[PDB]
Design a protein around this ligand. Structure first.
Ligand SMILES: Nc1ncnc2c1ncn2[C@@H]1O[C@H](COP(=O)(O)O)[C@@H](O)[C@H]1O
Ligand SMILES: Nc1ncnc2c1ncn2[C@@H]1O[C@H](COP(=O)(O)O)[C@@H](O)[C@H]1O
Ligand SMILES: [Cl-]
Ligand SMILES: [Cl-]
Length: 249
């Protein structure tokens, strides 16, 4: 589970002060990576998926906290509006792609086509069934050009998610947003997990990988999201005959 994703990193868990130092180093490196991508006119597209309260929002917050806000947009993706349904389901995401050298973060994304839309029946069986290759072909158009794509799935246990739901229910900034329907959707988690697993099997590609993040521990998840983003940027840079260096100071 969470232990298996943690057993992929041979490094140890850190106490709080050391976590804070490691986070600060990784955030400086992410800022440097952004300036490198801007200078070399390579776009970056980061996808985040996972159940409610898996920690997508907080992981994103630490990822871009020290990045220049001129160079990124975080898109919180919800259900399509009536105007968006007058086009193909990818249109609303095509519209949001960053320029060469810019960063776009998708907190939920086009993979909704094979997740919530499959689970709730909003997509027919033909639609979600053909969407895996549709999505691979879309991502491959971009990664054959001047874009790097990384997709993150934040795993969380039912138990840890329930703990977080109860925290939110007691939080003045968050209780207003937690509804009875959010609690009822917890009953659909087995089907969501099956759908996510088929998604991994069919759309985990060498140019657009799925990274499974152990989300039960938020501090570990933030560090892992940063490390994996940096590792993949460095490898794709090398594949392009570029070497990531310090371009800040
Ligand atoms: N592509 C999508 N198709 C259908 N429902 C979606 C899609 N993306 C997100 N949703 C749902 O839209 C709602 C958005 O609410 P929130 O994200 O809390 O603003 C949630 O119930 C999501 O599960
Ligand atoms: N609408 C709700 N508001 C608050 N807690 C809920 C709600 N629905 C379910 N729960 C919680 O879900 C857990 C299981 O309850 P139940 O699903 O009713 O067996 C308990 O911890 C409940 O407090
Ligand atoms: Cl269409
Ligand atoms: Cl808080």
């Amino acid at each position: 589970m969470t232990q298996n994703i943690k057993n992929l990193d041979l490094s140890i868990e850190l106490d709080k002060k050391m976590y804070k130092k490691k986070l600060k180093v990784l955030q400086y490196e992410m800022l440097n990576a952004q300036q490198f991508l801007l200078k070399n006119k390579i776009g970056l597209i980061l996808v985040f998926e996972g159940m409610d309260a898996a920690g997508k929002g907080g992981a994103i917050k630490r990822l871009i906290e020290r990045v220049d806000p001129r160079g990124y947009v975080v898109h919180p993706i919800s259900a399509p509006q009536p105007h968006e349904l007058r086009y193909n389901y990818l249109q609303r995401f095509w519209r949001k792609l960053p320029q060469h050298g810019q960063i776009a973060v998708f907190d939920r994304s086009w993979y909704g086509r094979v997740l919530v839309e499959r689970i709730e029946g909003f997509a027919t069986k033909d639609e979600w069934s053909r969407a895996y290759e549709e999505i691979n072909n879309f991502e491959k158009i971009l990664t054959a050009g001047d874009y790097i794509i990384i997709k993150f799935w934040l795993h969380v246990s039912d138990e840890e998610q329930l703990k977080r739901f109860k925290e939110r229910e007691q939080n003045p900034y968050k209780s207003w947003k937690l509804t009875d329907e959010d609690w009822r959707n917890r009953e659909k988690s087995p089907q969501y997990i099956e759908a996510a697993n088929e998604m991994f099997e069919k759309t985990d590609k060498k140019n657009a990988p799925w990274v499974l993040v152990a989300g039960n521990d938020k501090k570990y998840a933030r560090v892992q999201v940063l490390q994996e983003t940096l590792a993949h940027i460095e490898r794709e840079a090398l594949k392009r005959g570029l070497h990531l260096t310090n371009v800040l100071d």
